[PDB]
Design a protein around this ligand. Structure first.
Ligand SMILES: [Mg+2]
Ligand SMILES: [Mg+2]
Ligand SMILES: [Mg+2]
Ligand SMILES: [Mg+2]
Ligand SMILES: [Mg+2]
Ligand SMILES: [Mg+2]
Ligand SMILES: [Mg+2]
Ligand SMILES: [Mg+2]
Ligand SMILES: [Mg+2]
Ligand SMILES: [Mg+2]
Ligand SMILES: [Mg+2]
Ligand SMILES: [Mg+2]
Ligand SMILES: [Mg+2]
Ligand SMILES: [Mg+2]
Ligand SMILES: [Mg+2]
Ligand SMILES: [Mg+2]
Ligand SMILES: [Mg+2]
Ligand SMILES: [Mg+2]
Ligand SMILES: [Mg+2]
Ligand SMILES: [Mg+2]
Ligand SMILES: [Mg+2]
Ligand SMILES: [Mg+2]
Ligand SMILES: [Mg+2]
Ligand SMILES: [Mg+2]
Ligand SMILES: [Mg+2]
Ligand SMILES: [Mg+2]
Ligand SMILES: [Mg+2]
Ligand SMILES: [Mg+2]
Ligand SMILES: [Mg+2]
Ligand SMILES: [Mg+2]
Ligand SMILES: [Mg+2]
Ligand SMILES: [Mg+2]
Ligand SMILES: [Mg+2]
Ligand SMILES: [Mg+2]
Ligand SMILES: [Mg+2]
Ligand SMILES: [Mg+2]
Ligand SMILES: [Mg+2]
Ligand SMILES: [Mg+2]
Ligand SMILES: [Mg+2]
Ligand SMILES: [Mg+2]
Ligand SMILES: [Mg+2]
Ligand SMILES: [Mg+2]
Ligand SMILES: [Mg+2]
Ligand SMILES: [Mg+2]
Ligand SMILES: [Mg+2]
Ligand SMILES: [Mg+2]
Ligand SMILES: [Mg+2]
Ligand SMILES: [Mg+2]
Ligand SMILES: [Mg+2]
Ligand SMILES: [Mg+2]
Ligand SMILES: [Mg+2]
Ligand SMILES: [Mg+2]
Ligand SMILES: [Mg+2]
Ligand SMILES: [Mg+2]
Ligand SMILES: [Mg+2]
Ligand SMILES: [Mg+2]
Ligand SMILES: [Mg+2]
Ligand SMILES: [Mg+2]
Ligand SMILES: [Mg+2]
Ligand SMILES: [Mg+2]
Ligand SMILES: [Mg+2]
Ligand SMILES: [Mg+2]
Ligand SMILES: [Mg+2]
Ligand SMILES: [Mg+2]
Ligand SMILES: [Mg+2]
Ligand SMILES: [Mg+2]
Ligand SMILES: [Mg+2]
Ligand SMILES: [Mg+2]
Ligand SMILES: [Mg+2]
Ligand SMILES: [Mg+2]
Ligand SMILES: [Mg+2]
Lengths: 88, 145, 190
RNA sequence: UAGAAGGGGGCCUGACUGCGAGGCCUGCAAGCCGAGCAGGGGCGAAAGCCGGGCCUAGUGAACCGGUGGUCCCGUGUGGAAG
RNA sequence: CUGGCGCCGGUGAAAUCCACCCUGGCGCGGCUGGGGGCCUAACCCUCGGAUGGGGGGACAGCGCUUGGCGGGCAGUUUGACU
RNA sequence: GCUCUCUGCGAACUCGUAAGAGGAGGUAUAGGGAGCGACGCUUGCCCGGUGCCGGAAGGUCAAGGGGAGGGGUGCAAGCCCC
RNA sequence: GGGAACCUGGGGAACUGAAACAUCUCAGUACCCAGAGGAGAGGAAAGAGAAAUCGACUCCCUGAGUAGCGGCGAGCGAAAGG
RNA sequence: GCCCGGAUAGCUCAGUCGGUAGAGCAGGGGAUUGAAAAUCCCCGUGUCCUUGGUUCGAUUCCGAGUCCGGGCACCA
């Protein structure tokens, strides 16, 4: 949907199998349909000033580490690029 | 979540105490209210700093209170207090028990730290104790003339 | 400790009250237990076992001088039968039904030593040393032991009561050691 | 078909293992008969008969699996998984 | 033990005391689980423009995963002889 | 015009992947869905089967929790598996 | 912003084939979108695979319709090595 | 094909962490009753499925066998 640090979201398939297991008798497959795995997003408000990121919430922590950096710069309204960028 | 507390808390109070909390708690209370920080090597070691640095810097007035006691313990001043038998004429205050000392040997003494309750005012052989913590009993030999 | 600490048994009287109480495991499938009759044992205990010989009126000279205190014959079969207090223990080998005066008035009695030459001899070994201790329904184990007179000698409980591990199917793990008695009891790896 | 394939009785388990000349039938693939050799057996004194049932219906390719078994294979080697 | 011995006489089986243990229960501890309340700080809604004040509140919402309902929609199948 | 029914408001319902919009700058004397169809007189019996609503019990139930017990290996601790 | 094809990435059909059809096939094709440039891509081993071995990558010829994959159907189809 | 419970009086079902076999109903004998019920009394009958084994002995405890009833998954 976005990603911030991390990155985007794949597009998985499917498996409708109706069968034994291969540990009794065979096991056939009903249908493959195109699924879409959205990237478990989630939002973060942070103190750098009054900032907001949309961390892939598996990296939420990275938000802070990135906050744990006093790059020495007053207002700019966003000051995210530096953050989200002078990042790594 | 390993974090270092600042303000004293219940079940986890002693500041600088590294304690493990709920990710959430750390994130949305302790940390936001600045009651603690992320036990990150950065801060963690920087903590150790304020640890030793002061763990000895305060153990300083402890190394000198011992390299002091070994002298005022054996040394007595002896004040030339102008008096007559018992009652003195002008009680001897610490400032004198200090002045007549610093300007008699060259040693510095707090006209308050000496741990004195009253300027005496009566000749004799007085022995006391300096301050703070471990004490060093300095004595005074007030004579006449 | 490590293996055992026989010396660890350091009050009372002659502490012969030593035992093997390590746990066990029920019977896997169709099975049970059974202690090897007179389990060899690297000791003798210095016991004057009152070994009984199911002899007759002919074996009354050696059946006594073979390691037994006293021995009776067949003039006590249905003689010590008119009292519930009148009656070791061997048995007439073969298919002989010794279970005539032994099938009624319940104790301990089964297989024994064989020798159709004489009840006594110089080769009369194993017949006053060790015995048995089988299934207890609740949990068998519970064996015997010497007394407070031996260092690593008392460590017979090992390759003996411990090596008893010979009869058993499979449906668990025969273990949970514990040795001693009449005072208290410790325990260590078997 | 009683000059027994029918009715009864005594012992049995050939309602075997390895095979299979030569044919019947036939588009294929199937189905059917089968003397004889070997092994180790049954019944009979013996000659002999015995690879189910007087005979023709009582049945279903492959694929996919399941239970066993075994000389085989088993991804660098050994063992396993298969 | 610091005053019961222990066989008793009988009973399938004998008592002191030590054990390991079967049955069931109780009492503190480890580690995992359920249900009830209270709160706020995330999240959500609002508030003469709030570094905030109200309301809701770990629920909702949303991500991943489970199973179910499911002509709302889709792809299809619905034999031959005659 | 009558009846049944959903909807307490960030309404239900519709469109859209979403943001958001319509509903409605409305608030149950309002919105949505359904059937009948001015008005008059009326609208019987049947909850077996289907649907819907209600039932903090039971039955069955997927992940997941749980690990009795077993297996593959190594000299082993172990690592792995059911 | 533009450019005949060619190129990389992100998305991504059906008809057909299977003599029906759903897995499978057509096919990662058609097309849509972003981007690159005279090319684009790839590229200095967390490689290959049995060789006391080889030594970035790409292209061609073989290897090979082999190994395998597959309602073990229709059909799909490598890599090492040279 | 796996996982559960079972087999006890004619019938429907109980139960000790081994010691007797018991309820409800049907059925028969009696009282009461306008009639028919409901009440009220006394019983009647057992290889506790079949085998072993456990124990001094077993409805029971365990192995195994057959019939019976419930639950779940496959089906070339
Ligand atoms: Mg199925
Ligand atoms: Mg994580
Ligand atoms: Mg940075
Ligand atoms: Mg990074
Ligand atoms: Mg008597
Ligand atoms: Mg036990
Ligand atoms: Mg015959
Ligand atoms: Mg032919
Ligand atoms: Mg026939
Ligand atoms: Mg015949
Ligand atoms: Mg097929
Ligand atoms: Mg198939
Ligand atoms: Mg390998
Ligand atoms: Mg191998
Ligand atoms: Mg007594
Ligand atoms: Mg214990
Ligand atoms: Mg127990
Ligand atoms: Mg129990
Ligand atoms: Mg309790
Ligand atoms: Mg309590
Ligand atoms: Mg509140
Ligand atoms: Mg608020
Ligand atoms: Mg939630
Ligand atoms: Mg349709
Ligand atoms: Mg089609
Ligand atoms: Mg069809
Ligand atoms: Mg037709
Ligand atoms: Mg409006
Ligand atoms: Mg309405
Ligand atoms: Mg309407
Ligand atoms: Mg109409
Ligand atoms: Mg009327
Ligand atoms: Mg009517
Ligand atoms: Mg109805
Ligand atoms: Mg109803
Ligand atoms: Mg309900
Ligand atoms: Mg589970
Ligand atoms: Mg599990
Ligand atoms: Mg192992
Ligand atoms: Mg351009
Ligand atoms: Mg397609
Ligand atoms: Mg198609
Ligand atoms: Mg087709
Ligand atoms: Mg068609
Ligand atoms: Mg060129
Ligand atoms: Mg180039
Ligand atoms: Mg490159
Ligand atoms: Mg290989
Ligand atoms: Mg090639
Ligand atoms: Mg292909
Ligand atoms: Mg090639
Ligand atoms: Mg079946
Ligand atoms: Mg049971
Ligand atoms: Mg029962
Ligand atoms: Mg019955
Ligand atoms: Mg019963
Ligand atoms: Mg019955
Ligand atoms: Mg009933
Ligand atoms: Mg009744
Ligand atoms: Mg009745
Ligand atoms: Mg009656
Ligand atoms: Mg009646
Ligand atoms: Mg009758
Ligand atoms: Mg009758
Ligand atoms: Mg009635
Ligand atoms: Mg009646
Ligand atoms: Mg009777
Ligand atoms: Mg009966
Ligand atoms: Mg019986
Ligand atoms: Mg009887
Ligand atoms: Mg079937």
């Amino acid at each position: 949907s976005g990603k911030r640090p991390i990155v985007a979201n794949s597009i998985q398939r499917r498996g409708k199998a109706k069968r034994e297991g291969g540990v009794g008798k065979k096991t056939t497959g009903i249908s493959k349909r195109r699924q879409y795995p959205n990237l478990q997003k989630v939002r973060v408000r942070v103190a750098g000033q009054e900032i907001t990121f949309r961390v892939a919430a598996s990296h939420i922590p990275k938000v802070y580490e990135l906050v744990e950096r006093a790059k020495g710069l007053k207002l700019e309204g966003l000051s995210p690029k530096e953050i989200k960028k002078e990042l790594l | 979540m390993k974090v270092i507390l600042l303000e004293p808390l219940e079940n986890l109070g002693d500041v600088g105490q590294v304690v493990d909390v709920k990710p959430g708690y750390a994130r949305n209370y302790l940390l936001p209210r600045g009651l603690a920080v992320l036990a990150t090597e950065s801060n963690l070691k920087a903590l150790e700093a304020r640890i030793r640095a002061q763990a000895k810097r305060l153990a300083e007035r402890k190394a000198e209170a011992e390299r002091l006691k070994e002298i005022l313990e054996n040394l007595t001043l002896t004040i030339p207090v102008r008096a007559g038998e018992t009652k003195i004429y002008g009680s001897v205050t610490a400032k004198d028990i200090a002045e007549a000392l610093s300007r008699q040997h060259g040693v510095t003494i707090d006209p308050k730290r000496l741990a004195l309750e009253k300027p005496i005012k009566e000749l004799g052989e007085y022995v006391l104790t300096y301050k703070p913590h471990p004490e060093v009993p300095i004595q005074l030999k007030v004579s006449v003339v | 400790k490590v293996y055992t600490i026989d010396e660890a048994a350091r009050t009372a009287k002659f502490d012969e009250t030593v035992e093997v109480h390590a746990k066990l495991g029920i019977d896997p499938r169709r099975s049970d237990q059974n202690v090897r009759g007179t389990v060899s044992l690297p000791h003798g205990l210095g016991k004057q076992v009152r070994v009984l010989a199911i002899a007759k009126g002919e074996k009354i000279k050696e059946a006594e001088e073979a390691g037994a205190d006293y021995v009776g014959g067949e003039e006590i079969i249905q003689k010590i039968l008119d009292g519930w207090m009148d009656f070791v223990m061997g048995a007439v080998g073969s298919k002989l039904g010794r279970i005539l005066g032994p099938r009624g008035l319940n104790p301990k009695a089964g297989t024994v030593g064989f020798n159709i030459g004489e009840i006594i001899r110089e080769i009369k070994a194993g017949r006053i040393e060790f015995r048995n201790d089988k299934t207890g329904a609740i949990h068998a184990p519970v064996g015997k032991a010497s007394f407070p007179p031996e260092k690593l000698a008392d460590n017979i409980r090992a390759f003996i009561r411990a090596l008893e591990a010979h009869k058993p199917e499979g449906a668990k793990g025969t273990f949970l050691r514990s040795v001693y008695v009449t005072t208290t009891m410790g325990p260590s790896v078997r």
